[PDB]
């Protein structure tokens, strides 16, 4: 199965995020690193993109996910805002799933959409820029979790947020 190789982009990472050395894994730390601000860095929201943005075609990858609340992952338009507190919503260029209050959500606005999917360990993301879709599948039985149909009009970047200690996101492969 032909999947893209993604690495987290340290220039984008919120200063409190802890990236692994292989740039696959993301946790939230207790203290903000002293990092030089970069126009790309999320200075307030607890997010980080892969260094790869997408302009065209179909691309797959997988995300392993902690069992404790705190994570959200998906894709974001390149213009997603980095500076100050920003809403986490499709309006703002953010199409994600989320584990929060013991519940899986698709992050619709103005209300999140509860998913009835059972426990997740690993999710396949399929980004289709030709049709304009991003779908999520539980790898155990490739069960369908959610699709956002979107007419993407700029580059689309894999997105990760961890806003609690005690949980993680890991990119595969």
Author numbering: -2 to 170
Passage from the reporting paper:
Many of the non-structural proteins found in RNA viruses contain C-terminal glutamines as a result of polyprotein cleavage by 3C protease.
CVB3 contains eight proteins ending in Q, while MNV1 contains two. Remarkably, in ITC experiments with TRIM7 PRYSPRY, all peptides bound with comparable affinity. In each case, there is the potential for hydrogen bonds between the terminal glutamine residue and TRIM7 residues N383, R385, G408, Q436 and S499. An additional hydrogen bond is also formed between the peptidyl oxygen of the penultimate peptide residue (L or F) and the peptidyl nitrogen of TRIM7 residue T384.
